[PDB]
C-alpha cells in the first residue's frame, strides 16, 4: 500500500495535524479495545438484555467525537453476528449522544450489516473488496478515516521527497462529494449490484481524478419514486446529500455565470470562485485561471483553529452568507444596487434612513435558518432555497417557518408571506412603471434617489420578506420622490 | 360478599348514559387481552420479544384500552409472573405510546413486574381488598373493571333492586374526581407499615358521598418539601395525575366563597361562581342558600355526554371553555366600571364606537388554555390556571407559557416582550388612575365617563396589556385625550 496514515504528517505539518485532530473528521473511528473510554452509551445492568449484545462485542465506534452530527454507530468484532469472516458487523443499535439514548433497529437484531462491503469506502483508505471482475479478492484496508490522504491522495512518495512528489490540494466539490453523496459505483459486487460508495476497476476514488469514473451520484431526475428528494428538490433522506443538493444551486455555477456576463473582471472573482476566495494574501487569480464556483471549501475549512467547532465554518453562521450577499460598495443615489441581502435584513442602507432591522433580525434569525431548512432529519439543506409553508403542508415536509413558529399553522404562515409579497410586488410594479415613464428626468436628484430605493427592494429579491417595513418605507419614499 | 354489580347492570334503565360513557376513555380503561386479543396494542412481531424481554402471550390486561387526550398504554402480565406475589399481577416494564407509535422501555425493571393491586389498582377497580396492617391475612381480589359508574356513583346492588328507594350519589364535588386525579397517602397502611398510593382506610376504598380526607391525604406544595411533585411556581412537575391538588390552589375552588363574602351577591351571579347553578337542569332554581361548591371539575368536564369533546370530555370547545365565564358581556357601558373583560380584550370586541382590533395571537388561534394551562408536567396541561413566565422557565428549567409556541425566541427575549408591554401599560394605568381621582368633580361629564370605562377595561382585564397590547395602548391613549 501507498497509504502512510496521519501520524507521518505531524512532524512537517504540525499545526494542520493539530487542527485536523480536533475536527470530527479526525475523530471518526476509534478502536474501543485499545481505548475503552471512547465506547459511548450505557451497557450497565439490564441494557444488554434490551440491546441483545454487550460492550465486549464491540471493536469500533463510528463518529468518535460528535460535532454538528450526533448519532454514533458501533462496529462489532470481526466475523461476528452473521457477517463473512473477513468483514465486520455494523450493529443494530446506535447511540444519540445529544439526546443521550439508544436507538434500536429491531428488524436487524442479531444480524450485523457487513461494514467493508456496504459502508467503508467512505470510511477508510486503500479498501479492497471482491467485485464481479475479482470475486477472489481478500477484504482489507490501510488506514482509518476521515484522514489526510482521503482528501490529498496517498502520501508514500511525498513523505520521501516533499518538494519533488506533490500532494493534491483540491478546491473541487468532488473532493467532498466522494463521501457527501449517495449513488452507485461503476464497479459491481460479486452478485452484480452496485456498491453504495465510489469504486471502479482501480478501487476507491482518489483525489485529482474525476468522480464520475467511480460513482454515479443520485439526482432529482434519477430519484423516480421521490425517496431521496422532496418535490421542492430539497433532500428528504437524512444520509449525506450535500453534494447532489449543491450541484442544483447557483453556487455551483457561480463562475460560469460570471464568464457569460459582459462586465466580468478579476475584482468579481472573490465572491464567484473558490480559487480567488481561497487565494492567500498576495496571490492574484485571473478570469482565465479560475475554474470553480462557490464550492464546499469556500464555506468549510478542513483544518483551521479559527473555524467554528460545529460544521467547520470559516466564518460564524451570522457572517457565512453576508460575506458575499452584500452590496457594500454600491449603495449610492443614482446607481442600481446588486444583492443587498445583508443590508436589507439588518436595515443598514445609509441614504439618510436610520437603522431599521427587521423583527427577525433583532430576534437573532439569520440567512441560514430560512435558506437551509432542516428538510432531512437534523441536517440543514444545501439547496439554499426556502421551503414555503404551503409546500410544507402539501408534501408533509419541514419548512422554513414552522420549526421556529410551531404555534402558527402553515396556512397562517403562508398568509403572512403572501400578504407581504403581494403588497411589495404591487408597489414594485408601480414604481418600475413610473421610473420607465419618467426616463427623461433621469438626471435629477429626486429620480436618482427613487431609482436606488426601488433597486434595493427589487434586487434584494425577497419581495419584502427580509424586512417588510423597510421595503414599504423605501417604496413609499420612492413614490414621494417621483412627484 | 360484594355490593358492586358492574356497568352492564345499568344499560337497561340508563341506555344513553351507558352509550356515552362507553365512548369515553374512562369506559375503555381496562381490556382483558386473553378474552379479546385485538385489544393488545404494540408490535410483538419478529424480533420485538428479544428487545422487550417478554411476549404477547405473557399479557393479561392493557391499561388505557382506548387512547383519548392521554396516549401511553401500560400492560399487566399474567397472575403471579415476573417476580410478583402469587395473588397479584405484574405491571410490565414496557409501555406503548400509540400517539408516537413506539415502545418505551424502563430498562431498570426488565424482568421485575410491579405488583398491580397493592401499588395501583385502588384507582383502577371496584371492591378492592388487599392486606393491611389491620388485616395482614386478607386475600387480594376485586369486583369490576374501572373506570366505571360505581366509582363515581357508589355501589349499585341496592339501587338495581329498588331504584326509587335506594338512591345513587351524584356529586358535583371535586373530590368525586380527586379520589383518582391526585397523588397522596392512604390512611390505611400495608403489612410493612407504608401507605398505599391510592385512597384506602379501615373500610377499604373511597366511596362517593364520603369525605376524601378519611381515606387519603393528598400531596401539596407544603408537603412536597423536596420539590419532586411541584415546581417553585406551584405548577405540577410530576406528569402523573395532579389536577386536584392543583385545582385546590385556584380561585375556581373558592369561587362560591368569594361570592358569599361580597355584599352585592345575588342568584344571577351563581352561574359563573357555583357548580350547582352552572349545572342546574332546565327548570331548576339554585339560590345562595342551596349552593355549596365553586367551579369544580364537573363544570368543565362531562363524564358522559355525546356533545362533549372526544378528548378530555370538555363541555364546550377549548375556544369557549374559559370565555363562557371570563367575559363582561352585560357591563360595558360608558360611565360604568367593567369586570373581567377577558374574552372581549383578547378578541378586541369592546363596542364603545371602536372597531374590532383582535390581538395578533387571537387572530393566530391562540386561546386562554394555551397560556394559562401550560404543559408543565410532561404532556399534561396544568390546572393551576396561572401563566409560567419565561424567566421562571429559565430559572427552574421548566416549560413556560411562551417558549413552546416560540422556540425561535430565547426566554430572555420573550420575558423582555412581556416586561416592555407590562411596564408601559402599568405606567399609563397609574397616570390615568391618578388623573381620574384628581378630576373626581367632573365625573358627570361624558368625556370623563368614557375615560373611566376605557381605563377600567384595561385595568380589570388584569393582564397589563399582554392580552392585547395595541388595544390597551389605544384605550389608555384615548382615556388621556378625553381627560384634557
Ligand atoms: C464584478 C465587478 C462582478 C460581476 C460582473 C458580477 N458580480 Fe456578482 N453576485 C454575488 C451574489 C451573492 C450574487 C447572487 C445575487 C442574487 O441571486 O440575488 C451575484 C450575482 C451575479 C450575477 C447574476 C446571477 C443571478 O441572477 O443570480 C451576475 C451577472 C454577477 N453576479 C456578475 C456576489 C458578488 C460579490 C461579493 C462581494 C462581488 C464582488 C460580485 N458579485 C461582483 C460581480
Ligand atoms: C470521506 C472519504 C469524506 C470526505 C472526503 C469528506 N468527508 Fe466530511 N464527513 C465524512 C463523515 C463520515 C463525516 C461524519 C463524521 C463527523 O465528522 O460528524 C463527515 C462530516 C463532515 C461535516 C460535519 C462536521 C461536524 O461538525 O459534525 C462537515 C461540515 C463535513 N464533513 C464537510 C466536508 C468537507 C467540506 C469536505 C471536503 C472539503 C469533506 N467533508 C470531505 C466523510 C468525508
Ligand atoms: C456556504 C455557501 C456553504 C457551502 C458552499 C456548503 N456548505 Fe455545508 N454548511 C454550511 C452551513 C452554514 C452549515 C451549517 C448549517 C446549520 O444550520 O447548522 C453547513 C453544514 C454542513 C454539514 C453538516 C450537516 C448539518 O449538520 O446540517 C455538512 C456535512 C456540510 N455542510 C457539507 C458540505 C459539503 C459536502 C459541501 C459541498 C457539497 C457543502 N457543505 C457546501 C454552508 C455551506
Ligand atoms: C461567496 C463566497 C458566497 C457565499 C459565502 C454565499 N453565497 Fe450565495 N451566491 C453567491 C453567488 C455568486 C451567487 C449567484 C450564483 C449564480 O451562478 O447565479 C449566489 C446565489 C445564491 C442564491 C440564489 C439561488 C441559487 O442560485 O441557488 C441563494 C439563495 C444563496 N446564494 C444563498 C446563500 C446562503 C443562504 C449562504 C450562506 C450559507 C450563501 N448563499 C453564501 C455567492 C455566495
Ligand atoms: C426568513 C426569516 C428569511 C431570512 C432570515 C432571510 N431570507 Fe432570503 N428569502 C426568504 C424568502 C421567503 C424569500 C423569497 C423567496 C421566494 O421565492 O419568494 C427570500 C429571498 C432571498 C433571495 C432571492 C431568492 C431567489 O431569487 O432565488 C436570496 C438570494 C436570499 N433570500 C438570500 C438571503 C440571505 C443572504 C439572507 C441573510 C443575509 C437571507 N436571505 C435572509 C426568507 C429569508
Ligand atoms: C427561527 C430560527 C425563525 C425562523 C426560521 C423564522 N422565524 Fe419568524 N420569528 C422568529 C422570532 C424569534 C421572532 C420574534 C419573536 C416571535 O416569535 O414573534 C419572529 C417573528 C416573526 C414575525 C413577526 C414579525 C413582525 O414584523 O412583527 C413573523 C410574521 C414571522 N416571524 C414569520 C415568519 C415566517 C413567515 C418565516 C418563514 C418564511 C419565519 N418567520 C422564519 C423566529 C423565526
Ligand atoms: C365519573 C368518572 C363518572 C362515571 C364513570 C359515570 N358517571 Fe354518571 N355522573 C357523574 C357526574 C359527575 C354526574 C353529574 C354531572 C354530569 O356531568 O352530568 C353524573 C350524572 C349521571 C346521571 C344523572 C342523570 C343525567 O342527567 O344524565 C346518571 C343517571 C348517571 N350519571 C349514570 C351513570 C352510569 C349508568 C354510568 C356508567 C355505565 C356512569 N354514570 C358513569 C359521574 C360519572
Ligand atoms: C332500572 C331497572 C335501573 C337500573 C338497573 C339502574 N338504574 Fe339508576 N335509576 C333508575 C331510575 C328509575 C332512577 C330515577 C328516576 C329517573 O328519572 O330515571 C335512577 C336514578 C339513578 C341515578 C340518579 C340518582 C338517584 O336518584 O338515585 C343515578 C346516578 C343512577 N341511577 C345510576 C345507576 C347506576 C350506576 C346503575 C348501575 C351500576 C343503575 N343506575 C342501574 C333506574 C335504574
Ligand atoms: C378512578 C376511580 C377515577 C375517577 C373517580 C375519575 N377518573 Fe378520570 N381518569 C381516570 C383514569 C385512570 C384515567 C386515564 C384513562 C383515560 O381515560 O385516559 C382518567 C382520565 C380522565 C380524563 C382524560 C380523558 C382523555 O381523553 O384521555 C379526564 C378529562 C378525566 N379523567 C376527568 C375526570 C373527571 C372530571 C372526574 C370526576 C367528575 C374523573 N375523571 C373521575 C381515573 C378516574
Ligand atoms: C365559570 C363557569 C368559569 C369558567 C368556565 C372558567 N372560569 Fe376562571 N374564574 C371564574 C371565577 C368566578 C373566578 C374567580 C374566583 C375567585 O374565587 O375569586 C375565576 C378565576 C380565574 C383566574 C384568576 C386566578 C385564580 O384565582 O386562580 C384565572 C387565571 C382563571 N380563572 C382562568 C380560567 C381559565 C384559563 C379558564 C378556562 C381554561 C377558566 N378560568 C374557566 C369562573 C370561571
Ligand atoms: C360570569 C358570566 C360571571 C357572573 C355573572 C358574575 N361573575 Fe363574578 N367573576 C367572574 C370571573 C371570571 C371572575 C374572576 C375574574 C378576575 O377578575 O379575576 C369573577 C370574580 C368575582 C369577584 C372577585 C373580584 C376580583 O378579585 O377580581 C367578585 C367579588 C365577584 N366576582 C362578584 C360577583 C357578583 C357580586 C356577581 C353578581 C351580582 C358576579 N360576580 C357575577 C365571573 C362572573
Ligand atoms: C375549567 C374551568 C376546568 C376545570 C375546573 C378543570 N379542568 Fe381539567 N381540563 C380543562 C381543559 C380546557 C383541559 C384541556 C387542556 C389541554 O390543553 O389539552 C383539561 C384537561 C384535563 C385532563 C386531561 C389532561 C391533559 O390532556 O392535559 C384531565 C385528566 C383533567 N382535565 C382533569 C380535571 C380534574 C380532575 C379537575 C378537577 C379536580 C379538572 N380537570 C378541573 C379545563 C378544566
Ligand atoms: C398568552 C398568549 C395569554 C392568553 C392567550 C391569555 N392570557 Fe390571560 N394572562 C396572560 C399573562 C401574561 C397575564 C399576566 C399575568 C401576570 O402575572 O402579570 C395574564 C393575566 C390574566 C388574568 C389575571 C390573572 C391574575 O391576576 O391572577 C386572568 C384572569 C386571565 N389572564 C384570564 C385569561 C382568559 C380568560 C383568557 C382567554 C379568554 C386569557 N387570559 C388569554 C397571558 C395570556
Ligand atoms: C401558541 C399556542 C402560542 C402561545 C402559547 C404564545 N404565542 Fe405568541 N404568537 C403565536 C403566534 C402563532 C403568533 C403569530 C405568529 C408568530 O409566531 O409570530 C404569536 C405572536 C406573538 C408576538 C408578536 C405579536 C405582535 O404584537 O405583533 C409576540 C410578541 C408573542 N407572540 C409573544 C408571546 C408571549 C410573550 C407568550 C407568552 C407569555 C406567547 N407569545 C404565547 C403563538 C403563541
Ligand atoms: Cl382568547
Ligand atoms: Mg412570532
Numbering used by the authors:
A (entry chain B): 43 to 525
B (entry chain A): 42 to 525
Please quote the authors directly.
Surface-exposed OcwA is proposed to be the terminal reductase in T. potens JR extracellular electron transfer pathway, where it bridges the contact between bacterial metabolism and electrodes in MFC. Finally, rather than being a truncated member of the MtrC/OmcA/UndA protein family lacking one heme, OcwA is structurally related to NrfA, cytochrome c554, and MccA, which are key proteins in the nitrogen and sulfur cycles.
The three-dimensional (3D) structure of OcwA was determined to 2.2-Å resolution by X-ray crystallography. OcwA is composed by a globular heme domain and a three-helix bundle at the C terminus. These three long α-helices are reminiscent of the pentaheme NrfA (nitrite reductase) family of proteins and of the octaheme cytochromes hydroxylamine oxidoreductase (HAO) and sulfite reductase MccA. The hemes in OcwA present three distinct coordination environments, as follows: hemes 1, 3, 4, 6, 7, and 8 (numbered according to the position of the CXXCH binding motif in the polypeptide sequence, where X is any amino acid) are bishistidine coordinated. Heme 9 features histidine-methionine coordination, whereas hemes 2 and 5 have histidine as a proximal ligand and an open coordination site at the distal position, thus being responsible for the EPR signal with a g value of 6. These two hemes, located at opposite ends of the nine-heme arrangement, have an almost identical environment, with a histidine serving as proximal iron ligand and a His-His motif (HH 281/282 at heme 2 and HH 380/381 at heme 5) situated above the distal face of the heme, which in both cases forms a solvent-exposed pocket.
